[PDB]
Amino acid sequence: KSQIPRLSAINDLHKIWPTVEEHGAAIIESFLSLDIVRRLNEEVDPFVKIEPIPAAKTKDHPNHVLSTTTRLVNVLAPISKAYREDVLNSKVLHRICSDAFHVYGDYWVLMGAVMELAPSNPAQPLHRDMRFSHPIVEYLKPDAPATSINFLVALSPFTAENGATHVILGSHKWQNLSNVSMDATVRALMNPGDALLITDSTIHCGGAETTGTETRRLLTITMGISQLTPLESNLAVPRPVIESLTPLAQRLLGWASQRSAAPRDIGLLTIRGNSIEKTMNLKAEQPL
Ligand SMILES: CN1C(=O)c2ccccc2NC(=O)[C@@]12O[C@H]2c1ccccc1
Ligand SMILES: O=C(O)CCC(=O)C(=O)O
Numbered sequence: 084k085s086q087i088p089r090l091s092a093i094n095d096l097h098k099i100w101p102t103v104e105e106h107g108a109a110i111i112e113s114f115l116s117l118d119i120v121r122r123l124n125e126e127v128d129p130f131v132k133i134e135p136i137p138a139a140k141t142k143d144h145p146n147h148v149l150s151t152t153t154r155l156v157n158v159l160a161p162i163s164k165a166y167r168e169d170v171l172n173s174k175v176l177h178r179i180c181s182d183a184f185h186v187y188g189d190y191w192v193l194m195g196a197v198m199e200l201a202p203s204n205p206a207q208p209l210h211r212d213m214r215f216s217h218p219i220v221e222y223l224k225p226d227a228p229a230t231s232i233n234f235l236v237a238l239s240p241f242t243a244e245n246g247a248t249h250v251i252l253g254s255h256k257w258q259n260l261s262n263v264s265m266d267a268t269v270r271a272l273m274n275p276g277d278a279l280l281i282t283d284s285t286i287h288c289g290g291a292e293t294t295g296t297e298t299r300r301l302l303t304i305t306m307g308i309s310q311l312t313p314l315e316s317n318l319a320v321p322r323p324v325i326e327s328l329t330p331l332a333q334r335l336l337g338w339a340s341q342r343s344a345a346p347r348d349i350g351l352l353t354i355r356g357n358s359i360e361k362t363m364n365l366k367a368e369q370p371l
């Protein structure tokens with residue numbers, strides 16, 4: 084069984100996207116420092132606790148796919164400083180994304196979410212991402228460059244026993260799905276702050292939590308070309324929060340215009356030839 088390639092965020096930076104493009108998965112060791120992990124966890128903790136089941140009856144966009152033992156919290160910018168400052172500005176994240184998406188243009192956050200799995204959470208079925216949100220992706224030519232990638236960052240230990248993610252290496256290029264089986268998977272064993280990076284075509288699943296004891300938590304960052312609509316909205320984020328971010332983080336959250344890679348690109352989310360941020364006179368890097 085070939086295992087998932089493991090790479091250093093600092094020392095092997097230029098190899099990360101090529102490794103994923105080839106094998107469909109890679110593990111980025113120390114993607115986030117333990118201190119960032121700590122702060123993020125502390126900041127999102129109470130929002131995770133009050134989050135109801137994915138399909139809650141009070142929701143008008145219930146998630147019917149995720150297990151009732153899963154809690155998912157997105158739109159993290161208003162609730163986490165570590166997320167909106169450190170994570171959205173990660174140099175490692177942006178080098179990988181610009182490596183990946185140069186053919187298309189700008190990229191942004193399709194979804195940044197904290198997912199927590201209760202003890203005895205069952206394994207997910209093997210799947211590709213984006214199929215419950217972007218049916219357009221299924222109509223792309225089989226060899227089109229990936230239009231989104233997913234960083235699954237461990238916020239607690241990933242072990243075989245506690246349900247570490249399964250991936251099928253090379254499955255991002257599969258056209259024929261008859262060999263799909265758990266027998267074809269390897270695991271993503273990870274320390275907190277390590278990240279599993281996959282594309283939108285990589286076949287993977289969350290694993291079964293078999294201890295009955297441990298609570299596994301992750302930060303999933305789906306980065307995608309700016310030509311695709313995010314799964315989440317930042318439209319309700321307070322203006323003072325948005326104006327405390329970097330221009331780059333503002334763009335990632337849909338608070339800036341966007342560009343394609345067409346040589347004579349006419350742009351996305353523009354206003355009569357001017358950007359959102361020029362039109363609104365949007366401040367940046369202003370501490371609250
Ligand atoms: C239901 N959905 C998610 O909610 C989700 C969660 C985090 C990040 C992305 C994301 N989008 C997905 O496409 C999908 O995970 C796919 C899935 C398929 C089968 C079982 C469980 C999940
Ligand atoms: O739980 C995991 O490790 C993977 C979660 C996942 O793949 C999803 O919800 O789409």
Ligand SMILES: [Fe+3]
Pocket residue numbers: 210211212287288
């Ligand atoms: Fe998934």
